[model samples]
Each structure stands twice: as C-alpha cells, then as structure tokens.
Target: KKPKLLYCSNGGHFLRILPDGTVDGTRDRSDQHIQLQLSAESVGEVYIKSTETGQYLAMDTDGLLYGSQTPNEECLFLERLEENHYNTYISKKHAEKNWFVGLKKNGSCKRGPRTHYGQKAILFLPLPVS
Candidate 1:
C-alpha cells in the first residue's frame, strides 16, 4: 500500500491588488515571487502581485496575517503603511502601485529574478491544507 496525498479545493484565498487596480486571487498551490505594497492614499490598503501568475490582490494591511509556503524562508511581509512604499516592474506584468514598501525575493517556495525597492516584491501566504 502506498501513502496517499489528499487534496481539497475548499481552501482560503490569498487576495492582492495590482498596480493597475487589478485583483489577484490564489488558493491551494504554492506561489512565489510576489509583489507587495501599501497605498499612500489609504493607510491600511495593502496591494500584492504574483510573479508566477502576474496577478495582484488589494486588501487591508493591518490586522492581516500571512504564512510561508516554504519552511526554510520567511514569507509573511509585515510593514507599516507609511510613505516608504516604492514601485517597479520585473515579471510578465507591468503593474504599479503607490506607497510601495519593501520587497521580499526568494521568500516563497520558488526563486526568480532579483526584485528592487521601487520595483516588484514577493509576498507569500499559504493556502489552507486539508
């Protein structure tokens, strides 16, 4: 008998907003090379971009918790939504946002191009496992 890997689709969704005001949603599988941001116009507005899918999610920055898909690296990006946000474009998408914060590369299960301060950043959050 072989060990079975059970899978479920009813998992929590990770939402992020792109620079172009687009919404990116992901669940189940792991994601890497993410882009994160905090809007200068809105204090709690948090925006994120997916390097893997070129998708983005916009949500509240405060009171939000994130997890890492990889065990060796830290994934959750916790930064204050201040005037320190930056912007950039490195993936298949040309997204841009205001009040850009710091970016975390290789923070998820996968690794890719080097991200810049004002460029794109990686934001990783795990989908619920059943």
Candidate 2:
C-alpha cells in the first residue's frame, strides 16, 4: 500500500517518527504516523517511506530506526507475515544478525541488540490508511 500505518502488537500503538527523526510508537494517529508508503524492492523486501515527512525509514547498524532522505541498504527491510497473522520487519542488511524493528510495551523504541522474534515487541500489523 502507498499509505498505511504499522500497528504494533505490543501496546496497541502505531509506528511513528518525530520531526527530529526519532522513531517510536504512538497511540494516536497523526500525519506522521499514518502516512507510510511501503514499496517492495524484491519479493519479500520493502522500502518504507514517510509521505508526510518526505523521508524514508532507515535503520542503523545498531538497530536504531530513523527517517532518512536517502534510500540505501540501510533502508531495506525484510517483511514477513508471522504465523500469528502479525507482521515483522527485519533489517535486510542485518538479517544474519537478527536485528528486528521493535518497540517496547510502552511504545518506546527497542534497539536492535535488545530485540527478538518471539517477543511481542517485534510483532506488527500493517493497516490501511483511513
């Protein structure tokens, strides 16, 4: 979808980025949280964009997610539909390291070194925009 919201399964929050490029989860919908563009670069990989901010979702080597104006290997994500009907995004460049795009139960960001697949923090649902 050109526009969607990534709803986290942890605390029922949606993925959002702050104007300062801080990435986190939010309970309320806003232009920054609702306007996401997910386009596949390949079969199961994607490039996520923040339409409202005109930036792309990118992850650093440390597993910290942010918004960037450029798309590179850091901006590539491996999308997967888990068995529980939820979704998970892992850094394509860090696939072997198991770095997941995760958030804490309180809607705070979870750094890569602190994330795992079985944790609810890594589960998300891609919802269409309103």
Candidate 3:
C-alpha cells in the first residue's frame, strides 16, 4: 500500500474554482496532496501536511475552513477511528464538523456542522494509491 490520495468524491476529482469563477477538475489534486506523517515531537499522533501548496488543511472558529501557509490552529485536526470506510477527521479546535463533500467544495459543508452527513461534501475518501 502507498499514500492515500484525498479525493473529493463529489468534486468529481478535486474540483476547484478558477480565478474567473469557473470550476475545473482537469488538474484535480494538482494543488492538493494529503499525507499523514508521524509526529517526532509528539508520540502516537500524526501530522497531515500538503506538500503541494506547502500548507495544511485546517478548520476555522466559525466552522469555516482555510489553509494556512504553515502550521497553525486552523491547520490542526483531530482524527476519529472507524472500522469502515476512511477515518473521520474532526476539527481539533472546533471539535465538531468533519470534512464533507457535495456538489461543491468551497467548504460550505465542512463549515457549520455535520447537518448533512449523507452528502458527498461531508465524506473525505482516502483513495488507494496505485
């Protein structure tokens, strides 16, 4: 097994908004690279960083989300264990909403709360690496 690619299932494949306000997936995960790293400073925990944009995926106090250029409170997330599917990632700070997917990925689903868990915007699939 190799690294798991975080695929936004609803985004088709990393559907991102363009500067012109258009959605594109041709690059898909081009700007996104999700990795779980071991914590040398803190034992038993892992670090998730994006080597692509040199940022970390994070949650905001408003339940909103953003990527910090470096590690910050927003960049930190709590991991929840699950025997099925992929492990659910909870906001270490917010401690509520988990990353979800939907018709869009602007992060509306991951902002507020898990109001709609059935939606794709709420599901973070850890795709198998070839």
Best by lDDT: 2
> Which structure is stronger by lDDT: 2 or 3?
2
Full ranking by TM-score: 2, 3, 1
Better of 1 and 2 by lDDT: 2
**On residues 30-107, what C-alpha lDDT tens digit does candidate 2 reach at each position?**
545556889888999998888788688889988888988889889999998889998899999999988899889998
Whose lDDT is higher: candidate 1's or candidate 3's?
3
Q: What tens-digit string does per-residue lDDT give for candidate 1 at 1-130?
A: 1111111111333343333433333442343322333222234222333444443332223212233223211222233321333122122221222222222332221122232333334232223323
Which candidate would rank higher by TM-score, 2 or 3? 2
lDDT of 3 at 113: 61
Candidate 3, RMSD to the unseen true structure: 5.4
Candidate 1 regions with alpha-carbon error over 4 angstroms = 1-11, 16-22, 42-130
Q: Distance from true position, residue 56, model 2, in Å?
A: 1.1
* Candidate 2 positional error at 13, Å: 0.7
How does model 3 fare in lDDT? 0.45
